[PDB]
């Protein structure tokens, strides 16, 4: 349309912020497992990729939609974002490269920027509703 072409950018950015959010919480949750190799993604490059290409999430298949009572089930799905390794400091004898301070400052930053995106969408949508009344 032309309603979801002007709000598209903030919608995509905010969804990408949520995706990076559960990536970072997977970093946090695996704080003390051995050999974890903390992951992260590049937000700017991935956002440009999303705007140019689309979603194109890779890997996921649900069952079919026959008559009712056929037990829906789904495969393991993952966004098409290419997970990047976080360059570690302080080797730790168990491979776990999850630094609490790095992961946690990134978590707080990502949270704040997600809230900023929510504010921007709220402003744009309130503007639309203020025009139409």
């Amino acid at each position: 349309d032309r309603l979801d072409a002007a709000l598209r950018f903030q919608q995509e950015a905010l969804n990408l912020r949520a995706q990076r959010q559960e990536i970072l919480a997977a970093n946090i949750a695996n704080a003390d497992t051995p050999g974890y190799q903390a992951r992260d993604i590049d937000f700017a490059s991935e956002l440009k990729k999303v705007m140019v290409r689309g979603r194109e999430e890779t890997g996921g298949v649900a069952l079919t939609l026959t008559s009712s009572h056929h037990i829906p089930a789904q495969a393991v799905s993952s966004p098409a974002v290419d997970l990047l390794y976080r360059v570690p400091d302080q080797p730790s004898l168990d491979g776990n490269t999850v630094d609490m301070d790095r992961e946690r400052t990134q978590f707080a930053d990502n949270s704040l920027k997600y809230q900023m995106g929510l504010t921007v969408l709220g402003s744009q949508l309130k503007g639309m509703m203020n025009v139409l009344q």
């Binding site: 349309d1 032309r2 309603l3 072409a5 002007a6």
Partner: protein, 258 residues
């Protein structure tokens, strides 16, 4: 309930828009007595019954480039309801002219801000025809034809063709024709009466139709229209059917002409 529906809730809007146009324009549906909420709810609550089995997919564009689609539906509604008003205008002419014969309207002759004749005889026959319409299948054939338009002219990039608004323009047309064809016997008999009482002036120029003529012609008109009231019941049949045919024709003229 998401846009996984809330853009499939775009299935309701166009049929609702067309049904609402017809309701706001139709003869019985668009009477100021009905509370506005009833008419709106009837539109919504007809489209809810008709909306499934209507394969519609469009887009309410921002700064709508598809408003020319909305236009389309509104136009089709204006086609169906407003045309059915011709059948009433006819009688609202006929009876009116009958008053213009007896005495009732010499105020409208030589001059004003008050007409005063619309309340007298046109509203007799127009609401008589209102009842004649309703009593069938009056209220309904318009709605069935609207559904038929949904199935013949559903939603498209070529909504309306030219050469097709002349049909409705020079249609009435049959407003004058049918108003006459109804009021002809009454007019002719009162012409006979008027010319006879005028011929009385040859025996004496004092006979002064203002004094002799009008009381005679008023009784003649009232009694005669009482005697020729039932003649409306068959005529209304005609008066509706043909106009339906015209609508039917144009509704079925449009698809094979697109």
């Amino acid at each position: 309930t998401s846009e996984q529906w809330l853009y499939w809730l775009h299935l309701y809007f166009w049929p609702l828009l067309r049904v609402l146009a017809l309701i706001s324009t139709a003869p019985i549906l668009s009477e100021r007595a009905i509370p506005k909420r009833v008419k709106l709810g009837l539109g919504i609550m007809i489209t809810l019954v008709i909306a499934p089995s209507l394969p519609a997919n469009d887009t309410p564009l921002f700064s709508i480039a598809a408003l020319w689609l909305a236009m389309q539906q509104i136009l089709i509604g204006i086609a169906l309801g407003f045309t059915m008003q011709f059948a009433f205008a006819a009688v609202r002419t006929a009876g009116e002219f009958i008053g213009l014969q007896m005495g009732l309207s010499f105020a409208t002759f030589v001059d004003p801000g008050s007409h005063l004749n619309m309340p007298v005889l046109a509203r007799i026959m127009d609401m008589l025809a209102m009842l004649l319409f309703l009593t069938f299948n009056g209220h309904l054939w318009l709605i069935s034809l609207l559904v038929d338009t949904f199935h013949t002219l559903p939603i498209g990039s070529n909504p309306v063709n030219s050469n097709a608004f002349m049909a409705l323009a020079r249609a009435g047309g049959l407003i004058f024709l049918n108003g006459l064809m109804l009021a002809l016997p009454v007019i002719t008999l009162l012409l006979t009466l008027n010319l006879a009482l005028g011929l009385l002036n040859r025996m004496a120029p004092q006979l002064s139709i203002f004094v002799i003529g009008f009381p005679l012609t008023l009784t003649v008109g009232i009694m005669l229209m009482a005697a020729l009231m039932p003649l409306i019941a068959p005529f209304c049949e005609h008066l509706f059917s043909e106009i339906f045919n015209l609508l039917a024709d144009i509704v079925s003229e449009m698809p094979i002409n697109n």
